Amino acid sequence: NDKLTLWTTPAPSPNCRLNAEKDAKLTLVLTKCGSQILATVSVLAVKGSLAPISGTVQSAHLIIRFDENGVLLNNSFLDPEYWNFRNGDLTEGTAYTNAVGFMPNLSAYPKSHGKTAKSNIVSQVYLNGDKTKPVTLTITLNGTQETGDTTPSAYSMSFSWDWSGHNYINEIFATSSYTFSYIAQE
Amino acid sequence: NDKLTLWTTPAPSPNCRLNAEKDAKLTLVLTKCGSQILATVSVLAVKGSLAPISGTVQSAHLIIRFDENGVLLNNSFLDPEYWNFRNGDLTEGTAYTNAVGFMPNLSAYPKSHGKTAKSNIVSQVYLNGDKTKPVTLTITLNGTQETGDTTPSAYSMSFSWDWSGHNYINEIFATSSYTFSYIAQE
Amino acid sequence: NDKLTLWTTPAPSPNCRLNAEKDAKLTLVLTKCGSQILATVSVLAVKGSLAPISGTVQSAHLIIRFDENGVLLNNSFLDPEYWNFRNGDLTEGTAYTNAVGFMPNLSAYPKSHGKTAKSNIVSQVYLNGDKTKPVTLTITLNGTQETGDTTPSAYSMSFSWDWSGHNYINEIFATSSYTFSYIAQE
Numbered sequence A, B, C: 001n002d003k004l005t006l007w008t009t010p011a012p013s014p015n016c017r018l019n020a021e022k023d024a025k026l027t028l029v030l031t032k033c034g035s036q037i038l039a040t041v042s043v044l045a046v047k048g049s050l051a052p053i054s055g056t057v058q059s060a061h062l063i064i065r066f067d068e069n070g071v072l073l074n075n076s077f078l079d080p081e082y083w084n085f086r087n088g089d090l091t092e093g094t095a096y097t098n099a100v101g102f103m104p105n106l107s108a109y110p111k112s113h114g115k116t117a118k119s120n121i122v123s124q125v126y127l128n129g130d131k132t133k134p135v136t137l138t139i140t141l142n143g144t145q146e147t148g149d150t151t152p153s154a155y156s157m158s159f160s161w162d163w164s165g166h167n168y169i170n171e172i173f174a175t176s177s178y179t180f181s182y183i184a185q186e
Helices: none
Strands: A005-007 A024-033 A036-045 A059-066 A084-087 A120-126 A134-141 A155-162 A178-183 B005-007 B024-033 B036-045 B059-066 B084-087 B120-126 B134-141 B155-162 B178-183 C005-007 C024-033 C036-045 C059-066 C084-087 C120-126 C134-141 C155-162 C178-183
Touching: A024 B036, A036 A059, A036 A155, A036 B036, A036 B178, A036 C024, A036 C036, A120 A178, A120 B120, A120 C120, A134 A178, A178 B178, A178 C036, A178 C178, B024 C036, B036 B059, B036 B155, B036 C036, B036 C178, B120 B178, B120 C120, B134 B178, B178 C178, C036 C059, C036 C155, C120 C178, C134 C178
Parallel strands: none
Antiparallel strands: A005 A024, A005 A084, A024 A036, A036 A178, A059 A155, A120 A134, A134 A155, B005 B024, B005 B084, B024 B036, B036 B178, B059 B155, B120 B134, B134 B155, C005 C024, C005 C084, C024 C036, C036 C178, C059 C155, C120 C134, C134 C155
16 A cells, blocks of 8 residues: 555665675665555675675674654665655655554563564565575564664664575575565564 | 456366366466556366476466566466455455456566566475475566567566475475565556 | 464563473464564574574474464463564563464465375474574464364464474574464454
């Protein structure tokens, strides 16, 4: 919907940093179905060590941090330009000021409790949609674990892709789409 | 819902062609949750080479094609009789004329881009719901790839089940239920 | 939502019996999206043979039974105290009398047909959210299979976790969160 969908738009421009600024295209759509958020995620590297995959990396990580109002923190690895409520296949003209209804519930997934089993959704996605090339995806809710002397978030969602033990050298890091849901804050 | 649910009904009669006309029962329910469609799919072969599985087949495929209005194309492998909006545990008496809101988004999954990682959802389902008998399911959105000199679709959803490397000879091809979501066209 | 969400609350107290009374915390949220119910489930053992896992058990099972009105049967392995419609991060003050809209559809998943492939959703969850410790989860809808001379249910949902072949002795039985959907009765 419009106010019920917070997304990166369906076909985003490079909008996130896996290793270098805007080195990847993250497609993330959060659809509010009341108490739970229905999400679909996919990622594609466009430059750097993941395009194509080199021998120095066997995982990629992205941490999205939000303030108490569900707004992206200033030093976000996800570019804020096209992260907004939906309007057709694009986004609202003006930046949202509140998206708490899309945030991961703090009672279900307490802050810093990323080690807690429940705060993690773990599954396999596939490189280039190829069934013979599995990649483990671990989604952690409100795990954050602030990077020492930095600015703390109220909420966070982290994506961790791991292909340890596989030789995908020279393949472009691109994953199949994956669906998951989580309990909303309100 | 009624207009928010497009389905095969919950307990369909043979309604699709995996190899021969009406040789399988496809249960597919598309529930519209605004920007995303929540879906559940299951299939069961009722006759032919998949009931029971013989030695000449190690995969099964079904391609559903729709026109610009989200209506099934005339030569559909899915029988149109019970493919309609919901009414209780059955379908509306009259054939729908528009279901674009249930179609896979053309910006997220551009036509012919079935090779694109993002247009694919890949996971494992289980034969007869048995954890020891995995079957890989690859769902491709708007991949279509028109069969040469034929009639082109505006949208498509294809299901590909593969059990290469497994000996399921003499087992009936029937899968466990699987949930997935995708970005809607509107 | 409120009346569209039937849950255990997001951070429940010990509320279910895997082996002994209240030996586990089951977090189960059922969100109604019309024709389908979107669900997220997670479990954590707090005492007994699963906290930590001993050598006499390689699986855990929980069967939730409901009457014709979608109300928990009296001898429920799930404690009824905090199983109700949502109100913030808690539950309605008074016990619900009808939740048929959250029950698994009897046409899609006929009673006693738990052996039927379609009535089963099978996937892998991970112990302590650790990708190296898979646990198979089999969810069976309306399988029930009444325990001989007892009281029969109109609907049921059973969860079966199995780690046969793995040595998780001394690990606490706690799983990552998992999302699934099923066709609602109405």
